[PDB]
Design a protein around this ligand. Structure first.
Ligand SMILES: CCCCCCCCCCCCCCCCCC(=O)OC[C@H](COP(=O)([O-])OCC(O)COP(=O)([O-])OC[C@@H](COC(=O)CCCCCCCCCCCCCCCCC)OC(=O)CCCCCCCCCCCCCCCCC)OC(=O)CCCCCCCCCCCCCCCCC
Ligand SMILES: CCCCCCCCCCCCCCCCCC(=O)OC[C@H](COP(=O)([O-])OCC(O)COP(=O)([O-])OC[C@@H](COC(=O)CCCCCCCCCCCCCCCCC)OC(=O)CCCCCCCCCCCCCCCCC)OC(=O)CCCCCCCCCCCCCCCCC
Ligand SMILES: CCCCCCCCCCCCCCCCCC(=O)OC[C@H](COP(=O)([O-])OCC(O)COP(=O)([O-])OC[C@@H](COC(=O)CCCCCCCCCCCCCCCCC)OC(=O)CCCCCCCCCCCCCCCCC)OC(=O)CCCCCCCCCCCCCCCCC
Ligand SMILES: CCCCCCCCCCCCCCCCCC(=O)OC[C@H](COP(=O)([O-])OCC(O)COP(=O)([O-])OC[C@@H](COC(=O)CCCCCCCCCCCCCCCCC)OC(=O)CCCCCCCCCCCCCCCCC)OC(=O)CCCCCCCCCCCCCCCCC
Ligand SMILES: CCCCCCCCCCCCCCCC(=O)OC[C@H](COP(=O)(O)O)OC(=O)CCCCCCCCCCCCCCC
Ligand SMILES: CCCCCCCCCCCCCCCC(=O)OC[C@H](COP(=O)(O)O)OC(=O)CCCCCCCCCCCCCCC
Ligand SMILES: CCCCCCCCCCCCCCCC(=O)OC[C@H](COP(=O)(O)O)OC(=O)CCCCCCCCCCCCCCC
Ligand SMILES: CCCCCCCCCCCCCCCC(=O)OC[C@H](COP(=O)(O)O)OC(=O)CCCCCCCCCCCCCCC
Ligand SMILES: CCCCCCCCCCCCO[C@@H]1O[C@H](CO)[C@@H](O[C@H]2O[C@H](CO)[C@@H](O)[C@H](O)[C@H]2O)[C@H](O)[C@H]1O
Ligand SMILES: COCCOCCOCCOc1ccc(C(C)(C)CC(C)(C)C)cc1
Lengths: 66, 103, 186, 100, 69, 114, 96, 89, 274, 55, 81, 103
């Protein structure tokens, strides 16, 4: 019942590729980055989402009015 | 000269997978008991199966004595102790009339 | 930071006397389930956006460029041989999802890069952790408020516990009403 | 006896554990620890000690099974009922006649 | 040898036959056979069994309620 | 893939059986006995027994023991205890009423369960 | 003859009748203890067993909630499958 | 799952409705013959075999319970035997 | 009360009987260490050899110790423990089952999660369309409209990944049950023959005599028992390790040939060019 | 709570023992200890030879 | 139709003999292993050490099925009423 | 295992290499088709091509598939031997028990 390692490929057959470190010359591609006010607005939207989904615990609803 | 052998059991345990093996063994055995043997054998609702001659042969060194019922009287003593510690009324359960889920 | 302590005993009560659960209580629990499930996705989104706020262009191109997304299956020599893969072929090998498009837009966005490690990861995990915990906390708060405004047995139990009473005393006080009004004691 | 050699009667006692009471005291200890520490909801302590309990309770209260499990509500052995024709009806009428 | 989900290749890039050769039939016949085939065998069998039991499912619980009256 | 390992003599098997025979020879060397005081009841044919001539070895090792030769015999009186009690029980007179009411390990006894 | 098939009574009615049977078996023990002239502590030691059995039947009855009716449960009835109409994930909702 | 519960049922509907109709027909004929022959199962053996063949056990049990109730109504019996029967409502 | 859910555990003689099993390990001092070293170096070569070696040593020596206490130190649990199925399934088989998953669990887990992305394995995979099918479509196979049945696909692929880890569980269970049956049935049959012989001799007191001898029969039975059980334990160990090899450890065959280096005293770098 | 009933406290005497048969005593493996204690003691204390003078 | 349940208690002890007939059929195969080891060592005594594992290996397996055949007949009596 | 393994391997190789032959025959131009433009906006394709990515994305994809669909698959497998079985009518809740005025 069930298979064996003799009936299957190895962990060296799978994943046979060793590591090669790629490098690329710098032409100036990571310069002049725009959207300088992006993360401020992202944090504002995040806090807005948290505020609209906020719910304070109001135990005063359980007061013995009866 | 510093050694985890004589100065840190934690780093010794971390640096040796063959020390993790007994701990995983223990955890798996206890999880197996929790999943399978707990409710089927050890619970009070499932403890009379030890009186079975097929599934628990001679658990009491003999066939189970049903005229004596040691399980019944032991557990009855324990429930009586619980009732006396809680000061619960025995006859309050008999005043209940459950409805039916009509329709 | 106080509703979960009551909700524990309330949930034990509900599990025991589950026969006494209404449809509105069922819907409240289903809404809490919905909030719990959406909190995971919100945490994933916050983690992505936080790590992307601290990932360099190399770390981003690791997820866009198919040279890096093909390391499991494809030889690196197929990418070193120029002309092996065509431009359209590289295009179909690039990821098309919304995260990939977000990162593609984020290439041209100024940010505050860090070296790939525990801080770039913590900057995503912390917002995700706070999002998840706060959403679940506020969901449980909403659940408790709905139970307190719910005119039912569980609402009465929750109210009696919110007064400041002990669990056993509250169970006895509520079962005294259940036996009389609900069950019709002899 | 051979079965007597294949028997283990070296028990000492029966350990009785009220897992309900122990679960209650565990929850009480968790509450006491969280109150004494005055820990917030975002703590890993609070998360580990509360979230799994709340999740499992929410699942066990959300569960709405149309039918109960297999060996509890169906697939059960039942003796065949008496038919309203043939021999069963004759036996029923004979029983009614003998009783009355 | 004879591993699972494994196949050798010759200098021409073709799969070498381990037991049976099926590269004599034309490409049209191969495409006809393989357009609807997948890398999955037992799931279709389980699905046909489930469809048979669905065709032969029980409706007594509905008969008692009167959905067929 | 093609490691070209030389044969390791430690992986061979050319000492286990010699060592076992050395142990057995050490065992049988302690069976050597003198002619004086020698007696062995042979079979009715006159041929020797099997267990007979290998009692001296066992008892020569018992001679060399320290604790077992003074402890392991204390379970032997229990054999004669059984020999006596069995014969007492083969013919013990008992009450017919008690035997019919409480038979020991009899089948189909509802007080037992079956 | 015999047949392997569905349970006769619903779960709720089954638990109700079980609770009534244990109520009867406890009432009989109580009546016998009263006829024997036992006090409260002796009546406790006498009928603690049937009291616990009644309490367990009551726990089972309180634990079983009958199902709520909705479109998913009705579709599951039509499909004749055991289905939980309170889970978005199925078997993984137990761990999620 | 998805095919079995969202595409199969509209295709399996008529094949099952025909079986249901045939079982109802055989039920009606069988109980008609039983009303004729005074609940005797000796003459209507062809209809009994057809009823047992076409109608399943779970349907046969309900039909037997219904005929027991009908005989209780028309007075042929009193306190019908309902030892192993569904006591639903 | 309602909230009180009561459970009954059966407790016996455990502490003082389990302490001495460990205290004896200083006396035995891992006599099986050489055998297990030899077998591990036959079956696998990696840096994590010592881990699995130590694990197997612990398991085997515990088995040996329990067996010898079952043969000699006969009190209470030491007699039943080898005649019981729970010991043969969880105290010997489970540890050997989880040992490779504890030593090489990283590689096996990664392998399994890659096999969930099921694909055809090609030797000398110099194909390009294979790569495009593997990236774009996810697999070599045709994945058209499998999302329609994804619910079963997940679990079936999971089983398809562990199918070559399942026979190890099967063999462990099989040999544990085998050892339990061997011990139980041989003990029971031997005791039954003994009881029938004693009945014959009690009913015939001319024969109720130490007819073989006081020490001859005992020595012979001792040798028979120990020889048989030694054979069975050697079988259970050798087969457990050979099946461990043939079922789980052939996955980890990664032979690296030795390549001579030439640029020892100088290394090209990013600053050499840029 | 903890208990210590009197049912476990029973009379004890070696006179009431059924005992063992010759076969059961031989199967008890005491005679094997009896032999092999001396065997292993002899092997251990005979491996270590002392110095001597050959006469 | 009519329904007569019957509980045949004789089959408790019939099947015991029916299984008991098969307990010896492995033995002729068991002895094949040691006969093979004998004749193989008679062809090459020096190899007797390398084949002896396969000799012990050949016994306990061949013997095992006999034991499994013996299990049912003993599983048949001392548990079933 | 079975001896049909080389047969199944031949059939798998057949379908795989025929699909590759088809892709070679149709050649370039797939990105201009409508199928590609829909797969670019299809979440099934995103998930399927994210599965094979590195960085634990195979584990992520498998666990996500489990958590989403494999639970329903497990339930389906459990219900295959339930569809053919006689089941009783559903005791629908009367939704009357539970209401209680607050005090
Ligand atoms: C529609 C139906 C589903 C269709 C199929 C799935 C589609 C998703 C997908 O997988 O596509 C691939 C696609 C991949 O994109 P890509 O461009 O190809 O990849 C880019 C890079 O390669 C990525 O590189 P990277 O490393 O930078 O990315 C980080 C990584 C994420 O970062 C991580 O590394 C975290 C990894 C998390 C792993 C999953 C958790 C595992 C936990 C451990 C499990 C242990 C096992 C437990 C089992 C028991 C064990 C015994 O990204 C992902 O892997 C994507 C994860 C997708 C989120 C899944 C979250 C699942 C949480 C589990 C609970 C789910 C509850 C149900 C939710 C509601 C269901 C409707 O995924 C997405 O892009 C989708 C993400 C955005 C999701 C938004 C969903 C819409 C929500 C709208 C708001 C709320 C609803 C509003 C109402 C709407 C009307 C009803
Ligand atoms: C259970 C979870 C509960 C969570 C609840 C909420 C938690 C909230 C608070 C928790 C905050 C994080 C804790 C999470 C736990 C995990 C910690 C962890 O994994 O980090 C290990 C991490 C391991 O080091 P590494 O990742 O290998 O660092 C690589 C280097 O960056 C080498 O790479 P490099 O070449 O890029 O070097 C960059 C260099 C310098 O980089 C820079 O100067 C600029 C870099 C761009 C900004 C990066 C944002 C950093 C965000 C961190 C928070 C900033 C405030 C830090 C100062 C607050 C205390 C005065 O180093 C830094 O970037 C250091 C950060 C501060 C730089 C100054 C930024 C301006 C202010 C009109 O340890 C750290 O480096 C942490 C440094 C920050 C410590 C601040 C602690 C604040 C305590 C609270 C104060 C109240
Ligand atoms: C419609 C189809 C029309 C076409 C039919 C004609 C076939 C033409 C060839 C087309 C290409 C092709 O079929 O490729 C195979 C293709 C996929 O087959 P495969 O590559 O073997 O599947 C991959 C895995 O092996 C299996 O994939 P998997 O994902 O299903 O594996 C999962 C499976 C694991 O499967 C296993 O590994 C075995 C494990 C043992 C499980 C046994 C019990 C399973 C049952 C319970 C479920 O999991 C389980 O077994 C669950 C068990 C859990 C037990 C728990 C304890 O077949 C299909 O397209 C499926 C439909 C047609 C199948 C019948 C094929 C006909 C065979 C007759 C050949 C005679 C020669 C004909 C040529 C001469 C004509 C003149
Ligand atoms: C995920 C999408 C985001 C959710 C949208 C936001 C939201 O509020 O959720 C609304 C909706 C109601 O959730 P809820 O208000 O929190 O729970 C109260 C009850 O569960 C409510 O139970 P219900 O009977 O009202 O179920 C309603 C069901 C629609 O039910 C049907 O239409 C069944 C009839 C099919 C016609 C053919 O869902 C929908 O209304 C739209 C999705 C379909 O969410 C869902 O029902 C989740 C649906 C996700 C797929 C699960 C399977 C749906 C169909 C199952 C049929 C029965 C099972 C048959 C076996 C096959 C299973 C695959
Ligand atoms: C805390 C133990 C309380 C106690 O006295 O318990 C004492 C008992 C011993 O009692 P006896 O030997 O008299 O039966 O030991 C235990 O219950 C400890 C069990 C250990 C296994 C669980 C971990
Ligand atoms: C860590 C230290 C905890 C501590 O000191 O906790 C201290 C508390 C003290 O409770 P009391 O005030 O009732 O004595 O201990 C407990 O409540 C029980 C702890 C569990 C002990 C049993 C261990 C086996 C688990 C079975 C119980 C059910 C599971 C409960 C979750 C673990
Ligand atoms: C789930 C929604 C996925 C939508 C989709 O595009 O679905 C895409 C897939 C088809 O993708 P492929 O053709 O690429 O295999 O659709 C399906 O498999 C069936 C999903 C059910 C659709 C409703 C009927
Ligand atoms: C519906 C039929 C279900 C009843 C018997 C199930 C036999 C399945 C027949 C499907 C044939 C397709 C190939 C296959 O399943 O697989 C055929 C299998 C071999 O499958 P494996 O190589 O995966 O083990 O043949 C067998 O040995 C079992 C079938 C015996 C008949
Ligand atoms: C090379 C030999 C080949 C022939 C094989 C013959 C089968 C041999 C089986 C040996 C295993 C039997 O295992 C052995 O069983 C006996 C008999 O119960 C046990 O013996 C125990 O039980 C018996 C039964 O009454 C008691 O009388 C005895 O005092 C006690 O020691 C041993 O403790 C156990 O070790
Ligand atoms: C640890 O394993 C070593 C155990 O070896 C035990 C071998 O048992 C056989 C020993 O019994 C015998 C048999 C024969 C003999 C002697 C009778 C050889 C024959 C003699 C002395 C007449 C030549 C002595 C002892």
């Amino acid at each position: 019942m069930g298979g064996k390692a003799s009936e299957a490929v190895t962990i060296a057959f799978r994943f046979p590729h060793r590591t090669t470190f790629l490098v690329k010359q710098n032409v100036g591609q990571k310069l002049n980055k725009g959207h300088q006010t992006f993360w401020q607005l992202v944090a504002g939207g995040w806090l807005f989402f948290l505020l609209i989904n906020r719910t304070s615990f109001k135990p005063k609803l359980a007061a013995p009015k009866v | 000269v510093y050694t985890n052998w004589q100065s840190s059991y934690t780093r010794l345990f971390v640096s040796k997978p063959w020390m993790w093996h007994p701990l995983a063994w223990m955890t798996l055995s206890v999880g197996i008991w929790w999943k399978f043997g707990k409710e089927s054998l050890c619970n009070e609702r499932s403890f009379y199966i030890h009186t079975h001659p097929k599934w628990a042969p001679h658990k009491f060194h003999t066939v189970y004595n049903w005229s004596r019922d040691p399980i019944k009287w032991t557990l009855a003593e324990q429930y009586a102790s619980i009732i006396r510690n809680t000061n619960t009324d025995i006859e309050a359960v008999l005043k209940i009339k459950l409805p039916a889920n009509a329709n | 930071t106080h509703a979960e302590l009551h909700l524990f005993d309330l949930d034990e009560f509900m599990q025991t006397y589950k026969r006494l659960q209404t449809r509105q209580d069922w819907l409240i629990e289903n809404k809490c389930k919905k909030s719990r499930l959406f909190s995971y996705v919100a945490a994933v989104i916050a983690f992505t956006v936080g790590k992307s706020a601290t990932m360099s262009d190399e770390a981003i191109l690791a997820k866009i460029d198919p040279y890096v997304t093909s390391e499991v299956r494809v030889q690196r020599g197929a990418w070193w041989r120029s002309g092996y893969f065509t431009k359209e072929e590289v295009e179909m090998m690039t990821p098309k999802g919304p995260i990939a498009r977000y990162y593609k837009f984020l290439l041209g966005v100024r940010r505050f890069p860090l070296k790939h490690g525990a801080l770039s990861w913590a900057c995503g995990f912390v917002p995700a952790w706070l999002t998840f915990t706060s959403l679940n906390h506020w969901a449980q708060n909403r659940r408790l408020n709905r139970y307190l405004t719910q005119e039912s047995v569980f609402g009465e139990m929750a109210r009696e516990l919110v007064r400041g009473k002990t669990a056993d005393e509250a169970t006895t006080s509520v079962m005294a009403r259940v036996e009389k009004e609900i069950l019709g004691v002899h | 006896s051979p079965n007597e050699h294949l028997m283990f009667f070296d028990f000492s006692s029966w350990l009785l554990v009220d897992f309900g009471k122990r679960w209650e005291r565990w929850v009480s200890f968790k509450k006491s620890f969280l109150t004494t520490t005055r820990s917030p909801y975002w703590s890993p302590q609070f998360f580990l000690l509360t979230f799994f309990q709340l999740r499992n309770s929410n699942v066990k209260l959300c569960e709405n099974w149309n039918w109960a499990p297999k060996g509890d509500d169906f697939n059960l052995l039942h003796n065949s009922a008496a038919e309203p024709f043939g021999r069963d009806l004759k036996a029923h009428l004979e029983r009614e006649a003998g009783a009355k | 040898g004879e591993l699972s989900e494994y196949v050798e290749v010759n200098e021409k890039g073709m799969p070498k036959p381990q037991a049976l050769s099926l590269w004599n039939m034309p490409y049209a016949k191969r495409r006809a056979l393989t357009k609807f085939a997948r890398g999955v065998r037992w799931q279709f069998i389980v699905l046909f069994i489930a469809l048979y039991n669905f065709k032969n499912r029980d409706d007594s619980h509905l008969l008692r309620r009167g959905a067929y009256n | 893939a093609a490691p070209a390992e030389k044969p390791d003599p430690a992986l061979d098997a050319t000492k286990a059986l010699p060592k076992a025979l050395e142990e057995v020879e050490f065992f049988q060397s302690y069976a050597v006995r003198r002619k004086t005081g020698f007696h062995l009841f042979n079979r009715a044919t006159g041929s020797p027994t099997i267990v007979g001539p290998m009692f001296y070895n066992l008892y020569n090792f018992v001679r060399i023991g320290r604790v077992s030769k003074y402890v392991c015999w204390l379970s032997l009186p229990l054999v004669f205890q059984r020999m006596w009690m069995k014969n007492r029980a083969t013919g013990m007179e008992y009450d017919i009423d008690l035997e019919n009411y409480a038979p020991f390990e009899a089948k189909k006894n509802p007080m037992h369960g079956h | 003859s015999s047949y392997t098939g569905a349970a006769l009574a619903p779960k709720s009615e089954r638990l109700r009748l079980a609770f009534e049977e244990k109520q009867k078996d406890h009432q009989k023990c109580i009546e016998e203890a009263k006829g024997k002239g036992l006090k409260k502590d002796e009546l406790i030691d006498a009928c603690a067993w049937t009291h616990r059995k009644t309490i367990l039947a009551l726990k089972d009855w309180f634990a079983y909630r009958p199902p709520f009716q909705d479109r998913r449960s009705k579709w599951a009835e039509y499909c004749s499958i055991r289905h939980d109409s309170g889970s978005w994930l199925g078997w993984s909702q137990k761990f999620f | 799952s998805l095919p079995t519960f969202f595409l199969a049922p509209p295709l399996t509907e008529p094949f099952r409705a025909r079986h249901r109709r045939k079982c109802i027909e055989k039920k009606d004929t069988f109980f008609q013959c039983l009303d004729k022959n005074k609940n005797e199962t000796e003459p209507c053996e062809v209809e009994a075999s057809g009823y047992s063949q076409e109608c399943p056990d779970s349907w046969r049990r309900y039909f037997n319970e219904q005929r027991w109730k009908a005989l209780e109504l028309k007075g042929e019996v009193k306190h019908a035997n309902l030892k192993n029967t569904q006591q639903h409502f | 009360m309602l909230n009180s859910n009561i459970y009954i555990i059966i407790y016996g003689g455990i502490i003082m009987y389990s302490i001495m099993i460990i205290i004896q390990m200083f006396l035995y001092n891992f006599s099986n260490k050489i055998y297990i070293e030899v077998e591990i170096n036959k079956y696998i070569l990696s840096k994590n050899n010592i881990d699995i070696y130590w694990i197997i040593c612990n398991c085997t020596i515990i088995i040996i110790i329990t067996t010898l206490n079952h043969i000699i130190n006969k009190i209470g649990i030491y007699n039943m423990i080898e005649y019981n199925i729970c010991y043969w399934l969880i105290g010997t088989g489970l540890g050997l089952y989880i040992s490779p998953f504890i030593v090489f669990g990283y590689k096996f887990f990664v392998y399994i999660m890659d096999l969930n992305n099921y694909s055809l394995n090609i030797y000398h995979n110099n194909n390009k369309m294979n790569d495009i099918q593997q990236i774009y479509n996810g697999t070599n196979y045709n994945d058209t409209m499998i999302f329609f049945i994804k619910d079963i696909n997940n679990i079936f692929t999971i089983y398809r990944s562990i199918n070559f880890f399942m026979n190890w569980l099967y063999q462990m269970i099989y040999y544990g049950v085998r050892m339990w049956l061997v011990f139980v049935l041989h003990s029971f049959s031997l005791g039954s023959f003994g009881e029938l012989i004693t009945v014959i001799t009690d009913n015939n007191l001319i024969f109720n005599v130490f007819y073989i001898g006081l020490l001859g029969l005992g020595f012979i039975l001792y040798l028979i028992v120990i020889f048989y059980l030694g054979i069975q334990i050697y079988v259970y160990i050798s087969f457990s390790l050979s099946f461990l090899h043939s079922t789980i450890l052939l996955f980890l065959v990664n032979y690296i040939p030795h390549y001579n280096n030439k640029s020892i005293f100088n290394t090209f770098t990013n600053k050499s060019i840029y | 709570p903890s208990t210590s009933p009197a049912d476990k406290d029973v009379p004890m005497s070696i006179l009431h023992t059924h005992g063992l048969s010759y076969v059961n005593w031989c199967m008890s493996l005491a005679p094997g200890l009896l032999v092999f204690e001396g065997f292993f003691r002899a092997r251990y204390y005979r491996s270590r030879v002392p110095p001597s003078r050959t006469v | 139709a009519i329904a007569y349940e019957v509980t045949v208690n004789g089959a408790n002890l019939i099947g015991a003999g029916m299984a008991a007939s098969g307990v010896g059929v492995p033995a002729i195969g068991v002895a094949m292993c040691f006969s093979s080891y004998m004749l193989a060592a008679a062809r090459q005594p020096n190899m007797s050490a390398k084949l002896l594992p396969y000799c012990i290996l050949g016994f306990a397996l061949s013997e095992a099925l006999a034991l499994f055949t013996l299990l049912i007949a003993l599983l048949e009596l001392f548990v079933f009423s | 295992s079975s001896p049909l393994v080389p047969v199944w391997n031949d059939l798998r190789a057949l379908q795989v290499f025929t699909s590759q032959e088809y892709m070679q025959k149709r050649g370039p131009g797939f990105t201009n088709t409508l199928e590609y433009k829909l797969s670019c906006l299809n979440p099934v394709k995103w998930y399927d091509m994210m599965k094979v990515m590195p960085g634990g994305k195979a584990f992520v994809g498998t666990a996500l598939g489990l958590a989403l669909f494999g639970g329903w698959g497990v339930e389906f497998v459990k219900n295959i031997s339930v569809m053919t079985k006689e089941k009783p009518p559903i005791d629908w809740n009367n939704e009357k028990l539970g209401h209680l005025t607050r005090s």
